[PDB]
XYZ file of C-alpha atoms in Angstrom:
170
model
C 63.197 81.096 45.113
C 61.481 82.642 48.133
C 58.539 80.245 47.900
C 57.401 78.827 51.239
C 57.158 75.374 49.668
C 60.573 74.726 51.212
C 59.099 75.039 54.702
C 58.636 71.485 55.973
C 58.480 70.017 59.477
C 61.878 69.370 61.049
C 61.673 70.617 64.635
C 59.403 67.789 65.778
C 61.480 65.026 64.195
C 64.710 66.670 65.340
C 63.793 66.695 69.029
C 62.308 63.201 68.843
C 65.493 61.783 67.327
C 67.491 63.586 70.013
C 65.312 62.933 73.059
C 68.334 61.525 74.885
C 69.252 64.765 76.637
C 71.744 62.951 78.863
C 73.555 61.385 75.911
C 73.393 64.139 73.295
C 76.227 66.672 73.253
C 75.231 69.957 74.887
C 76.663 71.812 71.893
C 75.840 69.115 69.342
C 75.125 70.963 66.097
C 71.942 69.896 64.317
C 72.330 71.838 61.072
C 75.228 72.811 58.810
C 77.070 76.089 59.353
C 75.940 78.896 57.052
C 78.165 81.674 55.714
C 77.695 85.439 55.528
C 76.939 84.867 51.847
C 74.231 82.357 52.751
C 72.782 84.837 55.242
C 72.916 87.556 52.587
C 71.042 85.449 50.038
C 69.472 82.413 51.702
C 66.781 82.236 49.022
C 69.576 81.885 46.469
C 71.413 79.145 48.358
C 70.481 75.590 47.383
C 72.057 74.390 50.627
C 69.274 76.218 52.462
C 66.484 75.807 49.917
C 66.730 72.015 49.873
C 67.010 71.797 53.659
C 63.806 72.571 55.554
C 65.940 72.426 58.696
C 67.273 75.892 57.877
C 63.761 77.324 57.621
C 62.020 78.771 60.675
C 59.334 81.265 61.682
C 59.313 83.749 64.560
C 56.159 83.850 66.680
C 57.319 86.083 69.530
C 60.419 87.320 71.351
C 61.051 87.651 75.084
C 64.119 89.741 75.885
C 67.836 90.302 75.328
C 70.570 89.419 77.817
C 74.345 88.987 77.690
C 74.261 90.302 74.124
C 72.047 87.334 73.259
C 68.483 87.413 71.939
C 65.859 85.138 73.484
C 62.815 84.351 71.349
C 60.427 81.609 70.241
C 60.296 80.054 66.774
C 58.493 77.229 64.981
C 57.925 75.570 61.611
C 55.245 73.629 59.739
C 54.946 71.424 62.821
C 55.781 72.264 66.415
C 57.248 75.251 68.249
C 60.488 75.570 70.212
C 62.468 78.250 72.043
C 65.586 79.705 70.427
C 68.643 81.532 71.754
C 70.768 83.710 69.476
C 74.461 83.838 70.363
C 76.447 87.071 70.612
C 78.069 86.099 67.316
C 74.626 85.581 65.788
C 73.458 89.000 66.970
C 76.563 90.820 65.747
C 76.439 89.209 62.304
C 72.691 89.741 61.970
C 73.080 93.428 62.813
C 75.850 93.897 60.253
C 73.717 92.244 57.575
C 70.316 93.766 58.275
C 71.382 96.909 60.128
C 68.785 96.098 62.785
C 67.979 93.943 65.810
C 66.682 90.370 65.703
C 63.530 91.533 67.483
C 62.933 94.416 65.077
C 59.415 93.519 63.951
C 60.367 89.997 62.882
C 57.348 88.229 64.358
C 55.637 88.270 60.968
C 58.767 87.594 58.919
C 60.423 84.414 57.650
C 63.802 83.579 59.162
C 66.709 81.283 58.317
C 68.957 79.596 60.878
C 72.492 78.254 60.484
C 75.299 76.722 62.541
C 72.772 75.849 65.241
C 72.878 73.233 67.999
C 70.409 71.509 70.320
C 70.587 71.897 74.098
C 68.223 71.038 76.949
C 67.450 73.528 79.717
C 65.601 73.417 83.036
C 62.746 75.497 84.444
C 64.985 77.888 86.373
C 67.204 78.259 83.308
C 64.364 79.220 80.971
C 63.129 81.536 83.720
C 66.511 83.222 84.117
C 67.336 83.284 80.407
C 64.139 83.401 78.352
C 62.386 85.160 81.230
C 59.619 82.551 81.216
C 58.971 79.646 83.581
C 58.435 76.288 81.881
C 55.716 75.272 84.333
C 53.240 77.299 82.280
C 54.556 76.268 78.868
C 55.658 72.657 79.307
C 54.720 69.267 80.734
C 58.294 68.551 81.818
C 60.904 70.478 83.798
C 63.512 69.864 81.100
C 62.933 71.035 77.534
C 64.933 71.294 74.309
C 66.162 74.664 73.057
C 67.777 75.699 69.776
C 71.024 77.671 69.946
C 71.623 79.590 66.728
C 74.935 81.133 65.675
C 73.940 82.265 62.188
C 70.586 83.905 61.465
C 68.960 86.041 58.777
C 65.415 87.370 58.522
C 63.406 88.487 55.494
C 59.791 89.615 55.154
C 58.758 86.692 52.953
C 56.097 84.677 54.769
C 53.664 86.277 57.214
C 53.766 84.478 60.562
C 50.992 84.140 63.139
C 51.332 85.156 66.786
C 52.552 82.948 69.631
C 49.466 81.021 70.735
C 49.113 79.985 74.374
C 49.997 76.312 73.954
C 53.324 74.473 73.980
C 54.021 71.762 71.407
C 57.573 70.427 71.645
C 57.399 70.935 75.409
C 53.978 69.284 75.552
C 54.823 66.190 73.512
C 58.445 65.709 74.559
């Protein structure tokens, strides 16, 4: 099923339960690893369907650096920045024959093999190309690092509004 009924809040709870940025592993994975088969047919994979954590929406992308894509995603609740590893990019391209920023800001995406890591202002400035001072209340904010990703035009997504959520209520 491609129904969006499987899109439930998880980002908010995830960052709240892992607010200990000094204790949580920098590369601590937050969701199960997905396969190329899962990325091929995520709407046919119960592992994904029954786990809202795998569901995400793209609101806007920033840039690409070091063969990694830097964008912003959210869910039914709050919004958080996401970095796509070189592995993620390569696999995505093989699957979809396109880039992760190829008109995906109104599409519905699925993440896999992702971990949670906290970054500073200068980091988000140098990586995501955006200072946190304008999009956060704190100098240190959580970011999602995704190794498996696949995007399908299922659910139309709104644009990136000018207001932080996860970085505002951290």
